[PDB]
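User: Can you write out an input/output pair for a complex, sequences first and structure second?

Assistant: Here is one pair. Inputs:
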Amino acid sequence: AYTNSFTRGVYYPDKVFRSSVLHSTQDLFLPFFSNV
Amino acid sequence: VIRGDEVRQIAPGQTGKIADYNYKLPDDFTGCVIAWNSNNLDSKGNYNYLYRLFRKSNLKPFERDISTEIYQAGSTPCNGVEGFNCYFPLQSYGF
Amino acid sequence: SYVLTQPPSVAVAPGQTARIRCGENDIGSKNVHWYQQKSGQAPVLVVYDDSDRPSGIPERFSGSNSGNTATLTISRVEAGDEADYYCQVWDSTGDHPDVVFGGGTKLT
Amino acid sequence: LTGTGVLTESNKKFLPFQQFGRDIADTTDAVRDPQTLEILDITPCSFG
Amino acid sequence: LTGTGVLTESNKKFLPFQQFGRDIADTTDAVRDPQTLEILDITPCSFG
Amino acid sequence: TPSALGKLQDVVNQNAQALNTLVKQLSSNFGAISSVLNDILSRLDKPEA
Amino acid sequence: FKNLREFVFKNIDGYFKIYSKHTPINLVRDLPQGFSALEPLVDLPIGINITRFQTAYYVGYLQPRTFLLKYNENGTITDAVDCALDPLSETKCTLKSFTVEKGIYQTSNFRVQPTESIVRFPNITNLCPFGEVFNATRFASVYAWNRKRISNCVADYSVLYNSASFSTFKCYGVSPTKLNDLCFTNVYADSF
């Protein structure tokens, strides 16, 4: 059983209120355009 | 609860007996360790207090498990009161 | 007071192994050397260190130093090995520096 | 923290989870409190 | 010594005191096995 | 003679002299104990190490 | 089926994190187009070693990646870019903006990942003579110092440092961290 998944588990990179910025945070995240 | 010669694993900080196997701190630990010479409080010979001898790998911080986890060099798991190439985990110490 | 003690004689069959030792108290904290003297000529060194050998002498001769012993091992014994062997532990000897020699082993 | 600047209320998007924080250039950018429920970014004291 | 690389048998003839090597960037570029007396060189893996 | 091409021979020798010089600043200690980084990267606990 | 529930638990240094969000779903077996932005509430201790868990529900497998975001003025995630998915998004991650102009853009370089660790130890079991050299009765005077060469040790250097008898242990050209994992050629011991 394979299911194609788009953008699951994306989370804010810190606890900081983030607005109007381009934040380049290298961080442990789930990949995109994969199969689950 | 530690001895007097083994203050030096938590000051300044390295791996050891007391460090890896008894009370572990992180490798990038930045918080405050709590320690004071308190000879009149443990002493009353106090043989009730216990320690851990040795383990297969260096443990991760804040681990406590009351389990029968034997050190051994072989892959075959030993059980009983005495085991072949097996050292007992939980042993008492005196003050 | 440190004096080297060596056994008098040992006899082996040809083609077999030989165990010759020079061992005392705390000899593992010091260096051991070994020499070969044939009857009537100049001595030749055959073991340079605790285990290292010089040139000329092959891998037939080997040894190790651990604890209270330092044992020379001779493998595939031939006719040419019948000579005199001495251990040469250097010591400070109460701040009078001495080159102490052993009593000598005769291998037949 | 120490902030030398003009203080004015804000109406930012907030959570109890997102109680504290700083700017991308690390000025003060997220304050919440039970006394005054508005958020605070310290605009400086017209410095130049 | 910790490092990433693939080693082949070196064609160099080394005297027995020469165990390691120091190159122009002072890194280890030659090495000898402790069991067998063979000689091998050190380069890292493939790049791109 | 190399005197005509010695301008770009000086350019290529200045560049390659800077490159193998930059390898000699790979070799150098700059006050450290080694040109490697493996002296602390080992299993002791490091709050200060 | 109507409800989709998920939590994220991350276990570093003995901690046990909890992230919370609930999401309605209208699909039976497939996954929708939208996202799930969780938010943490509480972090717990455990004290035990956990390698397995046993229980409408979903499981995740975590690998490290690089990500570049974009935020509006209100403070909401508009889009996200996975910098190791395809080299277009790696170019987007390198240029710091989500629009890419026309040309060649020198992003990054690569090298081969190792497969396993290979250790060529000397295959002999022996305790190293630092137990015998340090525990010697006779030492010499300082002008006539004793010298020992030590050749074969497979045993560790852990007894060097890590004892209260060794009061002064300044190491100048090497760290005491490097003592446990090293390999060297020669050992000389000088005693006075």
